[PDB]
Design a protein around this ligand. Sequence first.
Ligand SMILES: Nc1ncnc2c1ncn2[C@@H]1O[C@H](COP(=O)(O)OP(=O)(O)OP(=O)(O)O)[C@@H](O)[C@H]1O
Ligand SMILES: Nc1ncnc2c1ncn2[C@@H]1O[C@H](COP(=O)(O)OP(=O)(O)OP(=O)(O)O)[C@@H](O)[C@H]1O
Ligand SMILES: Nc1ncnc2c1ncn2[C@@H]1O[C@H](COP(=O)(O)OP(=O)(O)OP(=O)(O)O)[C@@H](O)[C@H]1O
Ligand SMILES: Nc1ncnc2c1ncn2[C@@H]1O[C@H](COP(=O)(O)OP(=O)(O)OP(=O)(O)O)[C@@H](O)[C@H]1O
Ligand SMILES: Nc1ncnc2c1ncn2[C@@H]1O[C@H](COP(=O)(O)OP(=O)(O)O)[C@@H](O)[C@H]1O
Ligand SMILES: Nc1ncnc2c1ncn2[C@@H]1O[C@H](COP(=O)(O)OP(=O)(O)O)[C@@H](O)[C@H]1O
Lengths: 259, 260, 16, 241, 270, 265, 264, 262
Amino acid sequence: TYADVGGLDMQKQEIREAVELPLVQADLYEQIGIDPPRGVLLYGPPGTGKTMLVKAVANSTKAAFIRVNGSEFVHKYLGEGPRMVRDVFRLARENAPSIIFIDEVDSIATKRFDAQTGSDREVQRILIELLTQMDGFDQSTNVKVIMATNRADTLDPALLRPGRLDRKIEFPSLRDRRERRLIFGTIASKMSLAPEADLDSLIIRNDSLSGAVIAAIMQEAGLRAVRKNRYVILQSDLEEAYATQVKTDNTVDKFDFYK
Amino acid sequence: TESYSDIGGLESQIQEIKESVELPLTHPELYEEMGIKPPKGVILYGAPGTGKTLLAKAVANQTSATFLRIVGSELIQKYLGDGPRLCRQIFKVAGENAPSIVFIDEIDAIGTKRYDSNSGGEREIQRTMLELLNQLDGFDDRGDVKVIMATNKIETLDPALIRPGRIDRKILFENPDLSTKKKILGIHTSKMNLSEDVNLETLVTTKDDLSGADIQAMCTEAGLLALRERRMQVTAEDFKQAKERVMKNKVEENLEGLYL
Amino acid sequence: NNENVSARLGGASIAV
Amino acid sequence: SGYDRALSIFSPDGHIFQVEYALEAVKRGTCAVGVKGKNCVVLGCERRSTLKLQDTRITPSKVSKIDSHVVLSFSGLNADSRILIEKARVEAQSHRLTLEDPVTVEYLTRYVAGVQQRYTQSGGVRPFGVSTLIAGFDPRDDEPKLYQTEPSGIYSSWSAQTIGRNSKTVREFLEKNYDRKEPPATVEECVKLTVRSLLEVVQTGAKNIEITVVKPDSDIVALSSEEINQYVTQIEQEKQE
Amino acid sequence: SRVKAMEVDEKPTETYSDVGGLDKQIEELVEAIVLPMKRADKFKDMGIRAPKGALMYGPPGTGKTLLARACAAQTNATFLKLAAPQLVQMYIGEGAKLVRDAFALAKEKAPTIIFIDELDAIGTKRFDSEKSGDREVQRTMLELLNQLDGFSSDDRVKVLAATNRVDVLDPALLRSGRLDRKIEFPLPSEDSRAQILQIHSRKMTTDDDINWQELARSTDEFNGAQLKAVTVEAGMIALRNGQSSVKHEDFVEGISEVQARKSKSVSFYA
Amino acid sequence: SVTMMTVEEKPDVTYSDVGGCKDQIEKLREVVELPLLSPERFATLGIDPPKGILLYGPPGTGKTLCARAVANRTDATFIRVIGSELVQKYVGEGARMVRELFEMARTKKACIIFFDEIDAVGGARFDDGAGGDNEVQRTMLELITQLDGFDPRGNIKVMFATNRPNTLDPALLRPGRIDRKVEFSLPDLEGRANIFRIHSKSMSVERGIRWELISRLCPNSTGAELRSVCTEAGMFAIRARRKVATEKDFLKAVDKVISSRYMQY
Amino acid sequence: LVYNMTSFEQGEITFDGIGGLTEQIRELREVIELPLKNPEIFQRVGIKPPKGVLLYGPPGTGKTLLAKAVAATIGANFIFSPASGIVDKYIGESARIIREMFAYAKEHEPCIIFMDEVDAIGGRRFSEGTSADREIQRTLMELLTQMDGFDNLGQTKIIMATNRPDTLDPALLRPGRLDRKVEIPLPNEAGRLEIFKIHTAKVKKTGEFDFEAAVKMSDGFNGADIRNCATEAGFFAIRDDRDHINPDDLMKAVRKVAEVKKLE
Amino acid sequence: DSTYDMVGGLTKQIKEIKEVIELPVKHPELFESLGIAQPKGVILYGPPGTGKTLLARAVAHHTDCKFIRVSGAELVQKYIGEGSRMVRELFVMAREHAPSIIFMDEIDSIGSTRVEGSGGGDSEVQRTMLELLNQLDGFETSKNIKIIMATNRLDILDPALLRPGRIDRKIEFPPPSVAARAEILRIHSRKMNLTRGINLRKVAEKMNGCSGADVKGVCTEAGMYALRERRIHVTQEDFELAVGKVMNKNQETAISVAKLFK
Ligand SMILES: Nc1ncnc2c1ncn2[C@@H]1O[C@H](COP(=O)(O)OP(=O)(O)OP(=O)(O)O)[C@@H](O)[C@H]1O
Ligand SMILES: Nc1ncnc2c1ncn2[C@@H]1O[C@H](COP(=O)(O)OP(=O)(O)OP(=O)(O)O)[C@@H](O)[C@H]1O
Ligand SMILES: Nc1ncnc2c1ncn2[C@@H]1O[C@H](COP(=O)(O)OP(=O)(O)OP(=O)(O)O)[C@@H](O)[C@H]1O
Ligand SMILES: Nc1ncnc2c1ncn2[C@@H]1O[C@H](COP(=O)(O)OP(=O)(O)OP(=O)(O)O)[C@@H](O)[C@H]1O
Ligand SMILES: Nc1ncnc2c1ncn2[C@@H]1O[C@H](COP(=O)(O)OP(=O)(O)O)[C@@H](O)[C@H]1O
Ligand SMILES: Nc1ncnc2c1ncn2[C@@H]1O[C@H](COP(=O)(O)OP(=O)(O)O)[C@@H](O)[C@H]1O
């Protein structure tokens, strides 16, 4: 949930008002008289903590909710992809007010080059199944979309405009110390650790990190000690762990490849 | 429904279908006098906006025989084994209704190379392209039913059916020359006023790399473009603004100007 | 005997 | 197929391809006509009136003489035409050097084709996307002659010929009018023969033409823009109706 | 009904003087499948998991459908020679009932062998449009295979299978216990090619002054199917020219007529 | 039932009206007629003739006429197993016909059949064996199950046809399955000169003609582009309104059907 | 059944009637058996139980016999998904199969996977045909999200067997799961008689012992070698209809059949 | 639905649409008196977020004819040779109601240029609607049916579609001028509030020609920078704030220092 998430002090706010506030408070939007937004987009590299935030929103929405990752769309028999896509948006407006989540679209949301194939030509019209729905003759005022991607600079601009994605949001990089101190305190505090607590010795390091690697180090450090016929606590000799979270050394193609 | 006296241009092209279809019903004693029987088959190349379908519907106006209506995609079916029956249906009934004509159009939908695919559906057309062959020349003669097939591009398509036994002449069309643009223009414009400005032998000219169909757009786009000026009848400069428009995005010779 | 099979009635299929 | 992407292989019909594809390039170029009278030669061109920013102080020129008794005209593309013009005029002045004697026109014409034969035979090379023709007089005689050349490397001797856009209209035209039963004599009919020949292409633009003629005794003379403008009219003067 | 319509081919058989070459392949087989059929005791008494079956894979025209006919009458072990297609045809309520009857009878008449055709129609690895069209087929053969042994059976029924493709099949048959001995039929070397050539020709009238050797040398990418056919058409040439025999020439022009070369034959050579 | 309908019933065509293929018949009637006419000469050596021959060639090369020319000659049952009669839907209704097809043939003696354009069903080589259900796979494996594995029959002659041989299986080059691969291919001059004459019998031309000019003037061409000549050549006189043909007329008839000049020769 | 055996959780092959290892098998004892035995600690720490493992190395090691065997000790359902036999040329339908099994595994209450030859997933992408290689990640990427989404179960374990480790470098998929990656051995010369003691049992052979077997087993250190030598050495005492093995057939067997096990 | 007061931004285009649509329906007698032709359907190309689809929902509000729609790729289908059936069963539903406009939002999924290595059923059902528009019976269908299609970039397609005889006009919807950009603010603002001492042309002239739909984003977003603070009313500096922002990121990835040239 929200409290289970660490340092999203900024990003956490924009969606819990772009999703929850309207259905709870919409008369005040039109008390001005404007149309609120419909779509957003969450672009940042992996492990930066995006796919889990919606799962927090899933716990607290009091609406419907749908999970479709981008690879689920395609099949071998053409024509059925889009009707599956049409089956979605009709299901949404039916069980309204509802919203939708996608965990990846870079297999779909692309630049629409000049195709000369069936594969590269059939993927495109899938994308067209979205555009003719998200803004065509038949639209509505209950659906909202939560896109997602590990990166967003290639998917076509025709998808990127207002009416479609009124509020897209960034994510931090992996070298920003403030939240790093906030995550270790978060994750570690959820369980019981040692008094010898050299965690203000690890944050200071220059290394770049995600929210995913942190789940690795603090778990596999919880592995080595629990493996020691012990009961709870994790010894301050987890120096194995941090250095065990050095995957660049485990990449010979990052060791003896270009030279 | 249309007729002759509505084309003007195609003369080197039109004498054949006359020799294939319109004539032999009249004076077949010509062909036998030599000891000869006319073609069983015709085809028409593409180069669009040049009057292919127009020609076919003309002869329907005066043929004194049964005439048919097919586009290449009515043949295909869904149940995977009923398509090719449908082809034998249309040819036997034509014999029952002989003397008859057919017209299969845009058959690039059907006619393709033996692509040797892996799909499961693209096979059931190749068989459907094949009973035709086995029907049309095949094993046994069929009588006096004639084909007038059409397309828009053939330079890599229509593999094997294009041969004698099945088709005998290959008329081709292109964008006309300067000489034909004269008389063809008189066709459409022979109901309007043409107040005094005619000058037509400079209006149309070479380097107007246009079609034989766009002209009627130019003809009609002008009249209303004069109507909106509250002038029903027409002058020249009505047409000048039009030709400025419709020609604009046909071609651009930016890669030319090198062969100095 | 209305065991009307689906006829194996084809359908396209994307490649590769 | 694949038989047409080189110069050193034969299709099973026996004919190479990259050469006669050049004949499709030269078809995309401007006209170049030539005629010989009884005692004078002429030459034409489908000059362009492109735009009002080329310097009128220097009009372009298809024609380019190599010596005072020979000229040359072409069509196709100009870059690959600039070379052999310079390998020609070089070769002529050498023949004056070594032999103390000008060039017989046939000798010249077999040098330009003597390079269009190697520039297709030995690979590692592209041909000259150009056809040309030669015109002039032999020294010490009035014998008129013009020769044609083409990137296959062969030399013929037409009496009248053209190259490029709508040449097919013209090479049939002069056959209908020009003929050896009555060879012309002097300039004003060889030109009155020619200026009308251009008209299949010129679409009535007289800022789109140039012309030259030939002398005996190693001379030439160019021609003006009004000195055709009258000839624009006598040829139209017959076209009363 | 097909099981009654199907019958053992034990009575007419090649008699095994007709196969040529293949020194070690059959010696592998007899050492692996035949000797145990007559020493069921030791491979229960010495204590060892006997070879339950075996597989032969190799390209066409090579002696797959043949060799399985030799070994049976050689050893007096009845069988049936099966057909994946006639299982797979539009009849559906028999593909399982048949194969159940298959080992049922072969269990009787013991000791016996059983053999199947190309597995092109029942390899059936594919999870494509509908699996249940055929998964009830193999699974009974699997269970029917499991009937063969596992609790010290010594049922004396043994199984073999031939197929070109050793890759498209279900990868649930190479498993241990069920079978582990896949046999390659290599394409032949020259000393192996020639015995194939005599043996399809002894019925034919010939002379004695042939050297069969280089005729093998002229043949590579060929084996038995490609071989007897030229052994045929030589005689076919013998009549159009009118001979009463076949000469060395007639064989070699057979080669030139496998693929219809029809050379110019005088093109500036000498 | 329907199989009983498809029967030749005597079309009129000889071997006099076929030309340059003067030897390629000598392979074809070597297997059909003689085992059905003169089996004793093989029997004097006592061997198995081939059965299940084939022919492949380019289109319009002149193969179907032979397949019916052999019909009236033999005075024996000719059978046409044509397309659109083997791949009907409702599986079981498709492949039963081929079973019933041979069954008529297994009953009757002195019998030969014809499969027009096998590229439909035999040509359907399994696309890497893909497809959880392949309706043509099952019905192709039956006839090889009819013809290979064990003997179908002893006296029945079979001929296939193909505009495009590379499609069908590698199992149809193999004895029992298939024996011969005849190849009809393009003529030469002395063949063409005997294909013109037959198509010009009816024609009302007057002599003063030397087709030796024409064959030297008509390069690589089919046996059907050489009749179309005779149409258009005879036709130009008609729009020009003459009661007889010329030779020069052919010279501008030839120019079309085959279809700016190679001045470098 | 449709797909795989599933072992009915009790078909009890001996994970110790084997000449394998003690360290590795005890390394696996941690990640599987300890939680399913003893949840009182992972609960006490709150760490979720582990996420799968890799077992590299080429065959002969027995990197599939232990797997279903220890699974038989705990009693889960053992199945397959050989990536060589999962790829399909069509655009989707390689990922559908992934989606069936994570679902169908959960149709059963416990279930564990044995993927093998998974380099078919993890390819270097040296061809770079974007019509294809754009899809290769598409089906692969679906695995990453189909595998750890909402599944908070302690029953659905994962295994991936991968000969040729580190051939994959499109993505090493390191962070998070794969809580172990066992340093697989080969059969050491000491382990030979540890192995020959396995298959030799259930035989009456006058012993058939020797120290000339590891020297024979030198460089033929693959379990199939010993399975097959005991096979064919069993076929030589019957070559003369004898009653019991002689150890010379073993010294003959491994010497004369590891030949194919060393040249090809 | 929406209306013509809302599609402001232009008049020259829209004044050319009912040049072909409204006149033949209401008044063909002059055009039959003049008696020349019958100009059929229209295409309108332009970049996205410009008002293409918007004009096409309005027109239905102001038509009096029946107005059939097909959204993106609901004609391409799984089984074979019924996509065509899905077409020819369309137009027959039109001719029942002789005045019948149709609409298809996008064609670049269907009507892309044809090849042989791939593209099957779609390149077939295009090859029969192309027949239905101008064939024998199409001459019958050619009487009263009118067509509108709204691509994004037309070089992709065949010429046969946009070939005249059936497509007599090819309209451009370019991104606007200052006054065009300036007004549609009001068309997305008049609901808002008594905006306090404000100009809106001084800000449009700041934002050069980007698109139209973007302007719907600044106005809705500007109120949102006022919505957070319970500031129901609207500011000036919130506008040139937002418009100066939301296009910055659009001008963020355009930079590159490859520079293998000059
Ligand atoms: N000589 C002519 N006189 C009048 N109209 C002409 C003439 N030539 C062409 N056209 C116009 O061209 C159009 C027909 O084009 P065409 O015959 O190419 O259609 P088609 O047969 O379907 O081929 P395509 O699919 O390429 O349009 C007609 O609508 C007609 O207005
Ligand atoms: N070793 C051999 N000795 C004698 N003849 C052989 C031998 N190998 C192959 N042949 C010849 O090859 C043919 C038998 O091949 P076989 O039937 O075994 O393959 P197949 O079953 O046709 O292959 P497929 O199952 O792919 O059709 C016979 O004509 C036989 O004479
Ligand atoms: N030698 C010949 N003499 C006369 N006509 C010939 C000859 N060869 C070919 N033809 C002509 O060819 C036509 C038949 O061609 P044929 O059917 O043999 O080609 P095909 O490859 O079988 O065509 P398909 O493959 O479509 O069946 C006949 O109309 C016939 O006039
Ligand atoms: N000039 C304008 N007048 C009114 N609304 C406009 C204008 N320009 C943009 N819009 C707004 O932009 C959206 C319309 O986008 P537009 O129709 O240009 O894209 P589209 O054509 O629907 O894209 P596609 O059809 O390719 O999916 C609507 O929300 C509309 O309110
Ligand atoms: N702030 C955080 N606290 C704890 N775990 C985090 C945090 N951010 C990310 N993670 C971990 O990273 C994973 C999410 O990866 P993510 O970048 O969302 O991949 P994707 O977006 O492709 O699904 C989660 O499983 C979670 O364990
Ligand atoms: N450590 C071992 N001890 C005894 N036998 C073994 C051992 N490892 C493998 N084997 C033998 O090899 C077979 C397993 O092959 P294996 O190497 O697991 O194939 P893969 O590596 O492809 O899973 C078993 O049937 C067993 O008889």
